[PDB]
Design a protein around this nucleic acid. Structure first.
Lengths: 87, 94, 445, 89, 88, 99, 92, 77, 85
DNA sequence: ATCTGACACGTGCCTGGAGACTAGGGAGTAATCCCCTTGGGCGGTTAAACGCGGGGGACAGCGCGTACGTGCGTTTAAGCGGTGCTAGAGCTGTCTACGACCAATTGAGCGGCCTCGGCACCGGGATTCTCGA
DNA sequence: TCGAGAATCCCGGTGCCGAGGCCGCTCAATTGGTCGTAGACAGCTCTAGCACCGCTTAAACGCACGTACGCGCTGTCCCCCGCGTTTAACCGCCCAAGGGGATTACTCCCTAGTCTCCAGGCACGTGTCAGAT
């Protein structure tokens, strides 16, 4: 119940919660983590994802389709050096 | 306990498990948002987002191990942003 | 005689006759004086002859509380337990009763659809259940619902289904149920041969007096020129560009698929829904007169000014919650005091709001209220007029709403104003809901 | 090989400069390498996807999947213009 | 042939040879010519401009290297090239 | 043909794939045999290492967690899958002396 | 409908470790590992054919492709397994 | 013949990279990392050569190997 | 001396030492082999380039630890992140 | 000012271009049907947010000593030039012995259908690992 | 030190569900003549790679000497961690009428490869004229 204020929504990126970055770090062997780390991990996730999704959306359109299948993602990764077994 | 002993507890359990972190719904929102830019009006199967999530987690874990090495090189235990900026510069990532 | 009173007893007699034939039936008395009282009757009729045996009764939660309370009637002999919650149930799992022995001790098992579904394992072990009784049959109207799959794992030697609205959507819900009640199971008469033996729908003929007769009237509105422009741009795939000229906070959330029936309904509700979602415009339409660009909004306003001429309290319903929000914004700017209970609001919070709305002293006439809201027992008979600002594909839902104010305690005669717009999908939907009422009306025959 | 054309492209962009002999070599090598990358990509995109032909569409996807960034966004325009002129004429 | 400087015919032949696939369309030779031409033009421009800084009237391997190194796009396509007789 | 040689993998199926994969105009006769005999060797190695892994965890069946571990452990098979990310395979334990 | 080496990957396992199961979702990696190693070798050997300008992928080529993909001592013991087999196939 | 990569040369290369003050144990390490690199490239080159029935490491053999390892080398052929 | 070699495009190792090493490390793979006088040149260019990059990343790795004197730990931290033997 | 690269006109030879077939993959269409659409309901329950100490930790300053850079005079040995010698790269011509292809033949392995043992789960009991004083 | 207590670690017993099992059937892998063509290989020419000599001089080497940097040690104070409590966080299951899907199998057409002739570009040959070593 507001005036100009409508109904706001957070950034889909803020969805990656600080607790989840910490859990990914501890599996990497880290011990004490800083506070300026979280706003840094988010950017590097975003860049990776942007290069992969771009290739998948390309591989799709060429098939005249409009759905990104698993096989489109597996090829993008292989073009980038990372190979995923199991789909 | 004394700060640091429950932390070494966590670097053991998670290195032994193979269950995925990151809630499934938030990642799927993020990917879609990142996608409305390259091509407007596009749908995603479920398996695709699954694969994407698996890969991302691996990337981040690797980055996190090399950013720990870099920090130790400077005689610290806290990993700071400069270590993320040094590691990526040596690996070529944009 | 010698037991209970009228509008019942024969219902127990039907149930006992079913017991004799062992066939399983679907009592469907009009939603009036019966249900809980009649339900226990038959089992209570087991009394001495049969208070021993597995007895199960699945129902929502409010319904669970109610059944339990009612079981405190004449002859409080047989025991009962509300197997509710999780882990706390674990402690009562064995404490409440022995795994197999059922003397007079066995307390009636009263569970919910979640509990029943989530941990059927626990109850799977129990003996062939004498009578499993499912309060709201409509829950099983889909033949692929996971509850149905988990409900077959139970070893049931008898079944029973309580309802008041057997069919709502189409005939396939009758088909899925009939597999449940009876696995074995011009043309109108032929159907009545199969269904006469089991169905027992006693009308509100036995319990008359439904308060002053209600009036349901449809008052159309003329789609304005700003909505026509939006609709054509949406007839094809152009709405985005005509609105993408500013592209603030993304050019129409860079993307628009949707289904024509609901993107054009959203228009016919209020064009702001599209505009807000397309351009960032963090500020609501402040002209407070651009809210008046919607024809249906302007017909609501005038209706309401004429209904304040008398002040009798109104009721407003909608399908979504963005639209109720726009309405609230609009009226709050003028200054009206409003109360609102959608699904987003909490339970105890919404119960006190009613207790205040229902305050004989309080006079916040405008009460916003979603349609699918679970607040049936809201009972705000203080209000006298219901305005269905939208339609509903399944007509029964609307009917429930009608009940929410047309119930006991409404001295003042009630009107209903189903607003709509001509030359659009709103008129299409009205025809659909009308043919669904007709599908159930010939069945009432 | 591509000498004449690379000598011609230079005369058009920088009308008054020359080019040494070792430079021409580097340039020819570059052109040949781009060619090979582009063509290999196009072929692979055809074995899979089940097709015996390498049409224009595959020359475009290949250009998008290997030319990095805006550098591609232009090359695509440049190629579309030239196939349009050739087809219409 | 009709529109560019590069040899649409020869490019086509090279596609026929090397057995890249069974059939080659008609537009396929035409498009590639144009892309290669654009790419060469860009590089030759920056190098000459590089030479316009050094004021050298003749483009030499060093200039090409310098240009590739500076521009943010070519440095990415040309990731690890080691131009013969050049330097950092 | 698989029989004439001691191979267990299918020679014919590999030959067909090579001839139908547009890998070249004319495949010879020995090329299908050699390829089969190398593929078999590689598989045997990986499987043999993975099997040694399971018994340790006290299980008699192999799971992706085992193959990952085996690969990570051995040097050559690692230089080979230098970037591969096996699905649901976890990581190899590593805590430094900074403790 | 979907060709796979599952049948043969379980025969080699039995031969190497007699009494150990493999489980599904685990041969979904072993099949992929074989298909990928096939692809790499064949592609290398084609490039090595188109380069040497010959229209035939023979044994010599497959061998020089093995020596360049499979890394290290694997090569040696693969090369042997393979050559052994070609001589054997020859005297049939 | 690896002691012919003498102390002054390593120092010159290091000032191309950006180094300012060299230590005293950096030389042996450099001499090892050169050897590894040279041992990989040459192996691949000799393979390519033999495949062509020759006895002369030659044009496009080295270039091809260096490409193989992520290091395209324009010129030199 | 930093400035001087940053403007030049000359060779920094002598010629014949590089030849001998390359001949020996080949000997282990094949005996009695020849080498076009252009091959040994390509091999030198490439090697020199490689070493310059390693050194440029080692300098970065030292500035990290607040030194200016490169040390063997640095080369190693560089050749590990970059993924090498 | 000059020696080193340019830079320019010609022979011809080798390419492209043009004109046509029979072929034959691709653009067009219809179909079925099944995962995929925007907006809401209610009930779970486990993860995430917040606040508060307090113990770490990171950072700055200072001092000693040792290992690095610079300088100068020997001593290597690389570079150049020239001479001699032959291995082997490169190319040509013959003729066969590995290949493709077609057709007749049919058993190996493949989609869907069985079953039961090892593996996930533990609760109960039992054992070692912090920590604090 | 030594215990006090908390995380860690077994035994069974549980189901109980996926890892092995079997089985006709289809199509795909064999086996036999052709059917040429692609392969080896024998032989010759002449380029360029290797070995070796003598001389000049530039780069490498060794040793002395000074001082800047690296490393240990200390003290202050910021900010990260662990715990308990209160909110969100997700995840499940349901509406209902729509389409979006994408896959398969339907059908002919215009353009690929194919010839075939015939043009005139380019690779290579040659004379000029400068510009940066």
């Amino acid at each position: 119940g507001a005036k100009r204020h409508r109904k706001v929504l957070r950034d889909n990126i803020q969805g990656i919660t600080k607790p989840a970055i910490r859990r990914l770090a501890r599996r990497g062997g880290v011990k004490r983590i800083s506070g300026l780390i979280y706003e840094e991990t988010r950017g590097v996730l975003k860049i990776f994802l942007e290069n992969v999704i771009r290739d998948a959306v390309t591989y799709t359109e060429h098939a005249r389709r409009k759905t990104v299948t698993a096989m489109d993602v597996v090829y993008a990764l292989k073009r980038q050096g990372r190979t995923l077994y199991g789909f | 306990f004394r700060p640091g002993t429950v932390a070494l507890r966590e670097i053991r359990k998670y290195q032994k498990s193979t269950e995925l972190l990151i809630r499934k719904l938030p990642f799927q929102r993020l990917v879609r948002e990142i996608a409305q830019d390259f091509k407007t009006d596009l749908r995603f199967q479920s398996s695709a987002v699954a694969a994407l999530q698996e890969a991302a987690e691996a990337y981040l874990v690797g980055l996190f191990e090399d950013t720990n090495l870099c920090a130790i090189h400077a005689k610290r235990v806290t990993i700071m942003p400069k270590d993320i900026q040094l590691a990526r510069r040596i690996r070529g990532e944009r | 005689g010698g037991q209970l009173k009228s509008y019942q007893l024969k219902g127990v007699k039907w149930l006992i006759s079913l017991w004799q034939n062992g066939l399983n039936g679907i009592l469907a008395d009009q939603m009036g004086l019966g249900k809980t009282i009649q339900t226990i009757g038959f089992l209570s009729h087991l009394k001495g002859n049969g208070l021993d045996g597995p007895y199960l009764v699945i129902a929502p939660l409010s319904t669970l509380s109610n059944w339990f309370n009612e079981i405190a009637r004449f002859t409080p002999s047989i025991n009962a337990i509300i197997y509710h919650g999780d882990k706390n149930q674990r402690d009562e799992l064995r404490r409440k009763h022995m795994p197999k022995t059922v003397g007079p001790k066995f307390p009636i098992v009263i569970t919910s659809y979640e509990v029943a579904m989530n941990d059927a394992k626990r109850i799977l072990r129990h003996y062939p259940w004498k009578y499993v009784v499912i309060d709201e049959g409509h829950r099983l109207k889909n033949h692929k619902c996971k509850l149905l799959r988990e409900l077959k794992h139970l070893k049931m030697d008898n079944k029973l289904l309580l309802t008041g609205t057997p069919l709502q959507n189409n005939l396939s819900e009758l088909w899925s149920l009939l597999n449940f009640i009876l696995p074995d199971i011009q043309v109108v008469s032929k159907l009545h041969g199969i269904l006469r033996p089991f169905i027992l729908r006693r009308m509100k003929c036995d319990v008359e007096l439904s308060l002053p007769r209600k009036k349901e009237i449809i008052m159309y509105a003329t789609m304005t020129d700003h909505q026509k422009k939006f609709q054509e741009h949406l007839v094809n795939n152009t709405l985005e560009a005509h609105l993408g000229e500013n592209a603030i906070r993304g050019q129409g959330w860079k993307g628009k698929l949707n289904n024509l029936v609901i993107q054009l309904r959203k228009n016919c509700n209020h064009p702001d829904l599209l505009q807000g979602q397309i351009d960032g415009s963090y500020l609501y339409p402040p002209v407070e007169e651009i809210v008046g660009q919607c024809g249906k909004f302007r017909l609501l306003e005038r209706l309401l000014v004429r209904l304040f001429a008398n002040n009798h309290k109104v009721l407003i319903f909608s399908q979504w919650t963005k639209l109720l929000d726009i309405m609230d914004y609009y009226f709050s700017e003028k200054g009206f005091e409003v109360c609102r209970i959608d699904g987003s609001v909490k339970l105890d919070e919404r119960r006190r709001q009613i207790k205040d709305f229902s305050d004989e002293k309080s006079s916040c006439s405008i009460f916003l209220l979603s349609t699918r809201a679970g607040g049936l027992g809201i009972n705000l008979t203080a209000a006298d007029t219901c305005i269905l600002y939208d339609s509903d594909w399944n007509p029964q839902m609307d009917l429930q709403a009608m009940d929410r104010c047309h119930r006991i305690g409404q001295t003042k005669p009630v009107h209903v104003y189903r607003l709509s717009t001509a030359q659009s999908i709103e008129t299409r939907v009205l025809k659909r809901a009308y043919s669904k009422l007709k599908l159930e009306h010939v069945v009432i025959g | 090989t591509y000498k004449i054309y690379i000598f011609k492209v230079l005369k058009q962009v920088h009308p008054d400069i020359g080019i040494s002999s070792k430079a021409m070599g580097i340039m020819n090598s570059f052109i040949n390498d781009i060619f090979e990358k582009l063509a290999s990509e196009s072929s692979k995109l055809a074995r899979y996807n089940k097709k015996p032909t390498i049409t224009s569409r595959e020359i475009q996807t290949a250009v998008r999947l290997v030319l990095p960034g805006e550098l591609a966004k232009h090359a695509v325009s440049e190629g579309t213009k030239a196939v349009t002129k050739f087809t219409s004429s | 042939k009709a529109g560019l400087q590069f040899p649409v015919g020869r490019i086509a032949r090279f596609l026929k040879a090397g057995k890249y696939a069974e059939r080659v369309g008609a537009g396929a030779p035409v498009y590639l010519a144009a892309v290669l031409e654009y790419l060469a033009a860009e590089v030759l421009e920056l190098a000459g401009n590089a030479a316009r800084d050094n004021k050298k009237t003749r483009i030499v391997p060093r200039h090409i290297q310098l240009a590739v190194r500076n521009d943010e796009e070519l440095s990415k396509l040309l990731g690890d090239v080691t131009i013969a007789n050049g330097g950092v």
